Ligand binder design. Structure first.
Ligand SMILES: O=c1ccn([C@H]2C[C@H](O)[C@@H](COP(=O)(O)O)O2)c(=O)[nH]1
Length: 249
């Protein structure tokens, strides 16, 4: 893996390190999360992956806060944002150092074929997946749905489900998960105060084919359970970050 070019400028976040293919930021100031509302952190971070790769953006904290896991498309030249939700019904604070923000690359593949939709732009990582039925997501509840018809099989890659940013901004998070052979149960949580009605055929998540190297059972400084959970640890590509300040917009 050749360089991930990046720029970073944000005096409210510290660059902890950019090592072994993962860049980590930490919060220098308190971030307040109101209950029932989305909190977005504008990272002041811009990045471009090398050929054949996307980027994965995620947050880690021991506080009662859930972060959207973001799939960053290779053509994306805008600012990266971290989308957070409050698990509690009262204000939750992330004191300095309590939030870690990680960025790292992965190889992905794309099939040519709803319910699974082609990438919307050249090189987009995820294929949107359509809802098979109408769902009513009441506030602070989780609703699950099963996808049973197999996605296309891609040698040496593994189908996985991630959320999309638009729904996350509305307070609806998808728990990322592997789509194994017998089907996948996709769980959607509504962290807002509004009942959200999602109808049949609505795009509600995306299918990503991660190269099999990026999924491991082994814990190390090269992997993290914060992406897809503790069974399927995310092991990112061994790329090098290269600072290119002109990427900042
Ligand atoms: O947590 C996220 C997810 C996505 N993006 C950027 C990069 C993506 O290419 C683009 C669109 O994301 P989606 O709507 O596909 O999730 O937004 C972020 O900044 N943060």
């Amino acid at each position: 893996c050749p360089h991930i070019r990046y720029a970073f400028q944000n005096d409210k976040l510290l660059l902890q390190q950019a090592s072994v293919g993962r860049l980590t930021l930490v919060n220098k100031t308190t971030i307040l999360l109101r209950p029932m509302k989305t909190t977005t952190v504008d990272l002041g971070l811009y990045a471009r992956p090398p050929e054949g790769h996307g980027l994965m953006l995620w947050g880690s904290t021991s506080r009662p806060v859930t972060s959207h896991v973001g799939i960053i498309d290779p053509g994306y030249t805008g600012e990266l944002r971290l989308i957070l939700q409050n698990q509690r019904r009262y204000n939750s604070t992330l004191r300095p150092s309590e939030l870690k923000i990680h960025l790292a690359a992965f190889r992905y593949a794309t099939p040519q074929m709803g319910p699974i939709n082609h990438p919307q732009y050249p090189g987009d990582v995820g294929l949107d997946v359509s809802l098979p039925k109408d769902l009513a997501l009441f506030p602070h509840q989780t609703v699950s749905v099963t996808l049973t018809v197999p996605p296309p099989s891609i040698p040496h890659h593994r189908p996985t489900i991630f959320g999309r940013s638009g729904l996350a901004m509305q307070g609806i998070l998808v728990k990322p998960c592997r789509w194994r052979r017998g089907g996948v149960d996709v769980s959607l949580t509504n962290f807002s105060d509004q009942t959200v009605f999602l109808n049949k055929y609505r795009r509600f998540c995306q299918l990503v084919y991660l190269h099999k190297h990026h999924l491991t059972s082994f814990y190390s400084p090269h992997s993290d359970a914060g992406v897809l959970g503790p069974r399927s640890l995310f092991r990112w590509a061994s790329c090098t970050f290269e600072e290119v300040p002109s990427l900042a917009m």
